[PDB]
Design an enzyme around this catalytic site. Structure first.
Site, short mmCIF file in Angstrom:
data_model
loop_
_atom_site.label_atom_id
_atom_site.label_comp_id
_atom_site.label_asym_id
_atom_site.label_seq_id
_atom_site.Cartn_x
_atom_site.Cartn_y
_atom_site.Cartn_z
N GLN A 28 0.86 -1.13 0.04
CA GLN A 28 -0.08 0.13 0.05
C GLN A 28 0.88 1.24 0.03
OE1 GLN A 28 -2.23 0.49 3.76
NE2 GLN A 28 -2.79 2.52 3.16
N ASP A 144 7.25 -5.73 -16.22
CA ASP A 144 5.99 -5.11 -16.07
C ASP A 144 5.95 -3.93 -16.62
OD1 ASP A 144 3.13 -5.09 -16.21
OD2 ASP A 144 3.14 -4.87 -13.94
N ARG A 148 1.57 2.78 -17.23
CA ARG A 148 0.84 2.86 -15.83
C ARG A 148 2.05 2.81 -14.49
NH1 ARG A 148 -0.60 -2.02 -18.33
NH2 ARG A 148 0.54 -3.78 -17.73
N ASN A 149 3.11 2.29 -15.08
CA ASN A 149 3.97 1.74 -14.03
C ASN A 149 5.18 2.70 -14.32
OD1 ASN A 149 3.04 -0.62 -12.62
ND2 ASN A 149 3.47 -1.72 -14.66
N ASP A 162 8.07 0.07 -9.16
CA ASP A 162 7.81 -1.27 -9.05
C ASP A 162 9.06 -2.25 -9.90
OD1 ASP A 162 5.87 -0.61 -7.20
OD2 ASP A 162 4.42 -0.93 -8.96
C1 VZO Z 1 -0.46 2.95 -5.38
O1 VZO Z 1 0.80 3.45 -5.93
C2 VZO Z 1 1.32 3.14 -7.17
C3 VZO Z 1 2.50 4.28 -7.73
N1 VZO Z 1 3.26 4.45 -6.46
C4 VZO Z 1 3.63 5.60 -6.14
C5 VZO Z 1 2.88 6.71 -6.10
C6 VZO Z 1 3.35 7.93 -5.90
N2 VZO Z 1 2.74 9.20 -5.94
C7 VZO Z 1 1.26 9.40 -6.77
O2 VZO Z 1 1.11 8.67 -7.59
C8 VZO Z 1 0.59 10.76 -6.39
C9 VZO Z 1 -0.46 11.47 -7.06
N3 VZO Z 1 -0.66 12.34 -6.38
C10 VZO Z 1 -1.82 13.39 -6.69
C11 VZO Z 1 -2.32 13.29 -8.12
C12 VZO Z 1 -3.02 12.63 -5.93
C13 VZO Z 1 0.16 12.81 -5.39
C14 VZO Z 1 0.40 13.76 -4.50
C15 VZO Z 1 1.53 13.68 -3.48
C16 VZO Z 1 1.72 14.70 -2.50
N4 VZO Z 1 1.46 16.18 -3.02
C17 VZO Z 1 1.71 16.46 -4.13
C18 VZO Z 1 1.55 17.74 -4.39
N5 VZO Z 1 0.62 18.73 -3.71
C19 VZO Z 1 0.53 20.07 -4.01
C20 VZO Z 1 0.23 18.21 -2.48
C21 VZO Z 1 0.42 16.81 -2.18
C22 VZO Z 1 2.30 12.49 -3.56
C23 VZO Z 1 3.42 12.64 -2.65
O3 VZO Z 1 4.38 12.84 -3.03
N6 VZO Z 1 1.90 11.70 -4.55
C24 VZO Z 1 1.12 11.79 -5.48
N7 VZO Z 1 4.72 8.41 -5.44
C25 VZO Z 1 5.38 7.11 -5.53
C26 VZO Z 1 5.00 5.87 -5.77
C27 VZO Z 1 5.86 4.59 -5.61
N8 VZO Z 1 6.89 3.90 -5.57
#
Ligand code: VZO
Ligand code: VZO
Lengths: 267, 263
Positions: A28, A144, A148-149, A162
């Site tokens: 998660q 993969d 999307r990744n 990933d």
């Molecule tokens: C389930 O996750 C699948 C992909 N995994 C990963 C996902 C992700 N983050 C995102 O996708 C994010 C999508 N959003 C929004 C579009 C909702 C995010 C917002 C933030 C934090 N912020 C950013 C800007 N702001 C003004 C306020 C707060 C962050 C964290 O910094 N991450 C995401 N960062 C690292 C990994 C990793 N590894």
């Protein structure tokens, strides 16, 4: 529970978890902010945290953490930042990708039709190719690779996610049929990802049902050139989709080829 | 009299000389069938002699160009005429002249966007990286010796062959030229690019330059030039050649700048 790594251990008291972002099969991922990531230690930064969500999932998350330590840092991957392993639950602090994955990034910036200028799209492709070239040099096979990744930061930096660990439309034939994954198999996937970029987030093999895909790949057929896509980039996709893995280009050749394109448009 | 090279010989009846461009001498020309459609014509440039040992020099340059081989960012050999009469050396055409006059002519009175300038610097760096891998030391790298094509492709000229403002100290005081000496020159050329063709060390007499460099002083950051690129210039101007970056490191650094812009 777990050993204390002086190179990575981060104080729990300096990490406050924010709102979750999505549920992943191997854990998660939640928003969070970290106090002292840069050792000014008072300056805060936006990070993401991998954790469990209520087993052998712990062994997988620990395995991914250790792989990230081993693989090392690179501009175009999601880099490890810190870990919390002692005072309770396991947290794996990684870089934040504020703009989400590359696919939803591209779809959300589609013009009403029929921001996403050609140099920005070439830049996206070139950055992923750099990241994959680094992962390959660290003996990492992704298995993969897809839009999307690939994640996007606030500054439009592509970051492969990933990499330290059914989607047949991205899989090379040797992975479809022989269940074998090589770096050249990733190259095939990179070709599909290329097509995803220059369709602004389109679904591969449009219209064709999933059952016909295997025979049509066996009969030499590949996806058509997306609209407004230069023949040189489509030539790159087609090279990635050669049946023989040795005939597909290496990620190194892809880096060079995409760099000539980036330079051609920046001229 | 000159040996007949089947890899390069070109028929005179397919080369018509045009108007000269600068004084051996270099003239504009048109070549029929330079690409083997054989009827298609192309715009080329031709090195030739004027009016000696200058023949030996021109022949030497022709053969060096053969050895070094082709690259996008150098003036490539295209063909030679050696049999019937006067030696001609056919090379690529740089329709927009040298990089310095290219930059000065496009100065705003107060097209030369930051991506274009970084692109110029990156291309020269790739060309110098190739020349280095072919055991070639230029010894006179400067914006006047970089040429521009119709498509804004930078091409290093006069690589197969007094201007002290471009020379490294080991070249100034020891008459020693290495690849790191060229790296120092590349730093000066960088400065030229991000001044849109400015004269190096402005307002300083040539006599004071040597002591200035010995005292650790260098040119200042040109206006509007980012600190990252000025940091690259200063690295190229380190007294010790081993402390200067290699042309490979310069390619990487300028590529990251080009990418940071294009994002
Ligand atoms: C389930 O996750 C699948 C992909 N995994 C990963 C996902 C992700 N983050 C995102 O996708 C994010 C999508 N959003 C929004 C579009 C909702 C995010 C917002 C933030 C934090 N912020 C950013 C800007 N702001 C003004 C306020 C707060 C962050 C964290 O910094 N991450 C995401 N960062 C690292 C990994 C990793 N590894
Ligand atoms: C020794 O090097 C110093 C200069 N030598 C070298 C010079 C150069 N050419 C130039 O500088 C040129 C400067 N101009 C103009 C601005 C007057 C040129 C025009 C042409 C031909 N065209 C081009 C476009 N047209 C619409 C008409 C004619 C060419 C030929 O290709 N070269 C130059 N090309 C290669 C070398 C070389 N090598």
């Amino acid at each position: 529970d777990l050993p204390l790594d002086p190179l990575w251990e981060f104080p729990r008291d300096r990490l406050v978890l924010g709102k979750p972002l999505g549920e992943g099969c191997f854990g998660q991922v939640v928003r969070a902010e970290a106090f002292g990531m840069d050792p000014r230690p008072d300056q805060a930064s936006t990070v993401a945290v991998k954790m469990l969500k209520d087993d052998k999932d712990l062994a997988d998350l620990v395995s991914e953490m250790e792989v990230m330590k081993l693989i090392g840092r690179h501009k175009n991957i999601i880099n490890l930042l810190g870990v919390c392993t002692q005072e309770g639950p396991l947290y794996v602090i990684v870089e934040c990708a504020a703009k989400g994955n590359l696919r939803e990034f591209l779809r959300a910036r589609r013009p009403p039709g029929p921001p996403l200028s050609f140099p920005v799209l070439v830049s996206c492709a070139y950055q992923v190719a750099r990241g994959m070239q680094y992962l390959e040099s660290r003996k990492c096979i992704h298995r993969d690779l897809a839009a999307r990744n690939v994640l996007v930061t606030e500054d439009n930096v592509m970051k492969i996610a990933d990499f330290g660990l059914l989607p047949v439309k991205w899989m090379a034939p040797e992975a479809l049929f022989d269940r074998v994954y090589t770096h050249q198999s990733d190259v095939w996937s990179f070709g599909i990802l290329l097509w995803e970029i220059f369709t602004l987030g389109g679904s591969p093999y449009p219209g064709i049902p999933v059952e016909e895909l295997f025979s049509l790949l066996r009969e030499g057929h590949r996806m058509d050139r997306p609209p407004h896509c230069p023949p040189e980039l489509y030539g790159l996709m087609r090279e990635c989709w050669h049946a023989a893995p040795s005939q597909r280009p290496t990620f190194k050749q892809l880096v060079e080829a995409l760099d000539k394109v980036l330079l051609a448009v920046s001229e």
